[PDB]
């Protein structure tokens, strides 16, 4: 029933208040999505001026309803399963060797509008590491989502690995664990184990002043024959 939601070309806003060593910062995206072929376009802004962590960094914080799930593993699909009532998802990204990030996110439908609210808290990260040091390139971020049932929380469980191009040639690795629970109260598809099949391209509007990404990116769900 919330499959039906996706169908077409869907509206998202997406909105973040964080804190990372001890600095408060807030995110306002918006853009569209289009599950149908896995792919959403979306403009983010810093909207209390500069960003103090790396726009790289926030990319999978910043609505995996919007993966393509071919018709045969449809039966998978937790994420529009969930809506339009929604999900809550949360992570901890662990960055190598530096600090790490703890989020909690409710997606959900407004409207005819999908929207994720994101609360995020940075801590234990190194003043001249890779993160705060504004040391990570920005261009493109891949990976696959390795995604299982949680039957007790109805919902799914969910980890993948991050490589994060360094600008001196390195990686900076973020581990990321996900937990992913329905706000309401029907049931929802949970999943054999499969992943998403994820390419994020970062970019950036030649026009805009304001402290912002822009973001193309592919969410297809694989791994199931
Ligand atoms: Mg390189």
């Given at each position: 029933?919330?499959?039906?939601?996706?169908?077409?070309?869907?509206?998202?806003?997406?909105?973040?208040?964080?804190?990372?060593?001890?600095?408060?910062?807030?995110?306002?995206?918006?853009?569209?999505?289009?599950?149908?072929?896995?792919?959403?376009?979306?403009?983010?802004?810093?909207?209390?001026?500069?960003?103090?962590?790396?726009?790289?960094?926030?990319?999978?914080?910043?609505?995996?309803?919007?993966?393509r799930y071919?018709?045969?593993?449809?039966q998978?699909?937790?994420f529009?399963?969930?809506?339009?009532?929604?999900?809550?998802?949360?992570?901890?990204?662990?960055?190598k060797?530096?600090?790490?990030?703890?989020?909690?996110?409710?997606?959900?439908?407004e409207?005819?509008?999908?929207?994720?609210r994101?609360?995020?808290?940075?801590?234990?990260?190194?003043?001249?590491?890779?993160?705060?040091?504004?040391?990570?390139?920005?261009?493109?971020?891949?990976?696959?989502?390795?995604?299982?049932?949680?039957?007790?929380?109805?919902?799914?469980?969910?980890?993948?690995?991050?490589?994060?191009?360094?600008?001196?040639?390195?990686?900076?690795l973020?581990?990321?664990?996900?937990?992913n629970?329905?706000?309401?109260?029907?049931?929802?598809?949970?999943?054999?184990?499969?992943?998403?099949?994820?390419?994020?391209?970062?970019?950036?509007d030649?026009?805009?002043?304001?402290?912002?990404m822009?973001?193309?990116?592919?969410?297809?769900?694989?791994?199931?024959?």
């Amino acid at each position: 029933k919330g499959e039906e939601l996706f169908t077409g070309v869907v509206p998202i806003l997406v909105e973040l208040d964080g804190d990372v060593n001890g600095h408060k910062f807030s995110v306002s995206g918006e853009g569209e999505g289009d599950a149908t072929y896995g792919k959403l376009t979306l403009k983010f802004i810093c909207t209390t001026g500069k960003l103090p962590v790396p726009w790289p960094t926030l990319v999978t914080t910043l609505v995996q309803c919007f993966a393509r799930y071919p018709d045969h593993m449809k039966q998978h699909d937790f994420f529009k399963s969930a809506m339009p009532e929604g999900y809550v998802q949360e992570r901890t990204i662990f960055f190598k060797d530096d600090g790490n990030y703890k989020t909690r996110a409710e997606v959900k439908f407004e409207g005819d509008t999908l929207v994720n609210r994101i609360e995020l808290k940075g801590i234990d990260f190194k003043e001249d590491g890779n993160i705060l040091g504004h040391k990570l390139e920005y261009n493109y971020i891949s990976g696959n989502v390795y995604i299982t049932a949680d039957k007790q929380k109805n919902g799914i469980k969910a980890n993948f690995k991050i490589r994060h191009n360094i600008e001196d040639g390195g990686v900076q690795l973020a581990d990321h664990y996900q937990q992913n629970t329905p706000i309401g109260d029907g049931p929802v598809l949970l999943p054999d184990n499969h992943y998403l099949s994820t390419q994020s391209a970062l970019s950036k509007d030649p026009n805009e002043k304001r402290d912002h990404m822009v973001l193309l990116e592919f969410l297809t769900a694989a791994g199931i024959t």
